[PDB]
């Protein structure tokens, strides 16, 4: 799912 991709984008986020 796109929802799982969104999860992963958030897990790995580093601004």
């Amino acid at each position, epitope marked *: 799912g796109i929802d799982f991709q969104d999860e*992963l984008d958030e897990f790995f*986020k*580093n601004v």
Partner: antibody
Amino acid sequence: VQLVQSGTEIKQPGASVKLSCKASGYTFSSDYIHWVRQAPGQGLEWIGLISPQSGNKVYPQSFQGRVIMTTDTSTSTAFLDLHSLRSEDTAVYYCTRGRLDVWGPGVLVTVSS
Amino acid sequence: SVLTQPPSVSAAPGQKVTISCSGSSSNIARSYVSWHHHVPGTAPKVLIYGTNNRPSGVSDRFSGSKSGTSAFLAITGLQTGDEGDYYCGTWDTSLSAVLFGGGTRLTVLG
């Protein structure tokens, strides 16, 4: 905090292989398990990741179609099933935790006639 | 869609080296960066995760940082044990995948 891996595998081209990754101890739910390989003389290549909690997975375009990652009832016990093996797939396969902070010890898969 | 690294770096013992890693706005600019040291014959060693965290036991002369689409590993106090290949890794949101650089081979001169 560590990962233990199944042992070495020898396969014919065309064959498939199923590799296993297990956390050494106990974990609070899970983040993710990655698989990464390294062919002799080459660099690191990501094969995909799976949540041992939910079983949701993602694979890169380069491996989509040839790979199945599965988990069981456990919070830390993932599997990689690699199909349609070719000489090019000879490599050491590694599993890692979710932040790539902890790596399993590798297992060699040799594809040979 | 690809991560690039210089093919090699070199310094004399005791000096500092910095290893470069270049990506794009969909990966390095926005995702954690990890660094790994591999000596053919041995499993790769994690040196940096979460862009600047060192695993327990990793020497404090290694450090990670990031600026825009570029990430950097600095090694101070260079010793012969530091020789080998260094790979950066990061998550790309447009691809939904982990990318690895091509690796940088470090040589201790002299």
